[PDB]
Amino acid sequence: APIYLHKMPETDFLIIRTRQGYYIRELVDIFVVGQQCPLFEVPGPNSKRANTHIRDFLQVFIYRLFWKSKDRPRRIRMEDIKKAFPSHSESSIRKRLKLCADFKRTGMDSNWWVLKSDFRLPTEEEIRAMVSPEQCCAYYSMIAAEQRLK
Amino acid sequence: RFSVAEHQERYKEECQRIFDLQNKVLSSTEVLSTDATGRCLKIYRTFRDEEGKEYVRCETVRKPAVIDAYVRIRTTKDEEFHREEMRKERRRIQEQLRRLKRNQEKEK
Amino acid sequence: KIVAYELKTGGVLLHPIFNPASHLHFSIKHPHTLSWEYYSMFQCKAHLVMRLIENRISMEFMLQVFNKLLSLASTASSQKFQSHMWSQMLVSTSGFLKSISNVSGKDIQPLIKQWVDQSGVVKFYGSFAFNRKRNVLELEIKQDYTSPGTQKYVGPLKVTVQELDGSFNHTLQIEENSLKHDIPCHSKSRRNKKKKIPLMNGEEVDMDLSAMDADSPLLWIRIDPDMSVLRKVEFEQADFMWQYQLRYERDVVAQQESILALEKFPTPASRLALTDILEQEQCFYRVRMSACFCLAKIANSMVSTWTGPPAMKSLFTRMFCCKSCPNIVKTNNFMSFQSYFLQKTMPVAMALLRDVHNLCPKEVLTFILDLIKYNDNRKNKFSDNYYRAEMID
Amino acid sequence: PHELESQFILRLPPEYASTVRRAVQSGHVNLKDRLTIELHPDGRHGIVRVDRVPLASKLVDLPCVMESLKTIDKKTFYKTADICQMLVSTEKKFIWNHGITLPLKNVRKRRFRKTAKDVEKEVKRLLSTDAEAVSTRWEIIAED
C-alpha cells in the first residue's frame, strides 16, 4: 500500500499505559497509508479454506498445549481448549484429539487427555509450517466482515 | 465496436488517473477547514404490579433501525416453533437408563 | 558418491563426540588415522549438509552467517593481545549454530541432529496407484532402515507431480507408521482440447499423449526433486512416464534418472525417446552423453528385433560427417564444446554394440577405424589428444 | 502471561504542549512530578495536570486506525500496538470526526463510505420487557 510521510502535529504525544504506570514518547513521523493492494485472498464464510484454517488453528493450539505440559506422559485438559475455543462444538475438539490423544477415566491421569505413546509430537518448525500468521489475519478479516455485514 | 483494446486502455487510464488523484490528495499538506413503508412500530405490554394490578403499557418505536431488528426476531421466533427441552432430554435419558437396568436384571 | 560409500561401509559421521563410530576399522579421533576415502567422503558430506542448511535457512542468510564469521575473524586478526581476542578466528560447531540463530531466528538443531550427529543416509522405495473414482493419487513410500548404512527419516518430504494441468508440488509427512499418502489430482481437460501442457518452469510444450493412460491425468512423479535429504530413491513409474520425464522435463537430474531407469524398459518407444534426446541441442550435454550409453545398452538388449543400422551410426553421420560423403568424417573443428564432447563420446558408446554372436559388429569397428583414418586436425585452434585418446578407448 | 500494551495519543493546548515537549526531550524525572493524568470513572473524562495546572480532558474515538511500528534498522518495521483513542485536553461527543494527519480532515463525513440498513441493546431490552409481560399487541402503524 502506498504510504505518505507527514510530520506529526505539534501538540500530540504518545502515552503507553500499562498496569504499572503511564509512559510518554514524542512522535515525529506519521505515515498515511493509501488504499491497500491485497496480496492474500481472504476466504469466504463456510469456505473450504475457512474450515481448513479453523481446523488447523485448533490443531496447532492443541499441539502447543501438549508441548507446554510438564507431565512425563504429556497430558492436557479439555476445558482449557473449551476456554480457548468456546464457539466450537465439543465434537470437533474431540475429533482433533481422537488421533494423537486418548481419554483416561480411571486410575492415574484420570479426566486427562494423555498423548499416545506411538504418536510423535511435531517439532517447532512443523507446527510453524502448519498455520501461517497471514492466514490468521485473513481469517480475522473474514469474521470481522461477517459481523459487520450481519 | 472495439471489444478488446478499447476496454483495456479505458480501464488502464482510469487506473492511472485514480492512482494520481489519491497520491496528490493524500500527500497534501494544505490545511482543510472544519465543516420503505413509512410505518412506525407500536407495542402494547400487559404486566402485573405489586399487590394486585393489571396495567398495560403502549410503547411506540419511531426508530426504523430498532424496528427491523425487533420484527426480525418475532418472525424468526414465529417460525422457531431450550432449557425445558434439555430437562426433557435428561428425563428421557433417565428413563432409558432405568429401562437398560431392568433389561440387565431380566438377563441376570 | 556418498550414498554408495555409506551403504558400502557404515557411514560418515560429521561432528563426533569423544568410540563414536565403531562400525569401521579405523579411529575417527584424529585426521591422521582416517582412511583417505573416508576423508574424501567427509568433505563431500560436509558440503552437502551445508547445502541442506541453505535449504532450510535461505542463501542470503547463509552468506550473512559467513560474513559474520569473517568479520569477527578480521576484527580479531588486527589486535596484538596474545589470544585474548585471537580465538575469535577459530570457529566451533556451537559458535556456528549460534551465529545462524543470531542472523535468522530459526535454529537447525533437528537438521543438525539428523544429518550431522547420526551418520546415515535414507533409502526410499516408492510406488503409486491412481484412484479414478475419487481422482486421487495414492503414493506408497516405504523406507529400508535395517540396512547397515541407513537411518529412518521422519521429517517432511516434497513430491512433484506433473499432470496435464501442470506441475504441482506436495509436502508429505512421513512418520514411522506411515505408508499410504493420498494426494489430490487435477482435471484432464487438456486432453479434451489440444492445449499445451505447462511445465515446471513458466513455459508449455506440445506432448504426444498417445502413450498416456486414458484414465489418469498424471504424466510423471518425482519423489524429493530438490535433493533436500541425503537419499536414494527407487520409484516405480510406468515406462511412458519415464519417457515423458526424459523428454519434457526442465531438470537435468530428472532427465538423468529417467535415462538410468529406461535401461530396464528396452521397448522401441524408449529408443525413440533417447534418440530424440541425442538429436536435441538445447538439452544439457551431459544428458546426451549418458543417453549414448543408455542407447547402447538398450540396443544390446533388443537384438533380433533391431531393424536398420546399428545404433547412433546414422545419427553420427547426420551430425558429424559430410553431407556428400557419409563414411568420411568432417575435418575437426572443436569450437562448439558440446558437439565436441558428444562427438568424442559417441563411438565409445557405439563400440559396446554386440551382435547375436556376442561379437562387436564389423560395421561399427570399421566405422571407428574410418574415424581414426580420416581424422584431420590441421584447421581447428584446439588440440586433438583427448578425441584421439577416446578413439583408442 | 503477556497483556497487549494500550497506547493512546495525548493532545494538549499548544503552550502546554511546548512545555511538555521541552520537559520530555530534556529527559529528567522532574517531568514525572510535573505531568500527571487522572481518568474519571466515566471513562471518557479526565484531568491532565501540566506543572500542577489542571486541564479538562475527553477520551475520544478516532475515525481511522493507527498502528505503532517500531524498528531497529529503519528497513523492517514491527507492529507494536493499535491506537484508536485520543485524550484531547483544553456518545456522539466522544467521537472525533477528523484524523490526526493534515490530509485526513472531515474523514468520517467525506472520505468514509457509509452503509446502513446501541440499537441492538435497545431491541434486547424490548425483548426482555416482552418476556416479563403477559400479553403483547403489535401493529405496524401509519401517521398518528
Place this chain on the structure above:
DNA sequence: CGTAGGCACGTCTGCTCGGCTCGAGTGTTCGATCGCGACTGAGGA
C-alpha cells in the same frame, strides 16, 4: 450398630442422516476470422 448392592449426571464413543462447498465433466452461445460470389471504379484493345 455396621456394611455392600442399586439410582442421577458428565464426558466420551460411534453410527446415521442431511446440508453445503467445490471442482470435474458435459452441453450451449456468441464473437472472430476464412472463404465465396459479387460490387465497382479503373488503365489498356
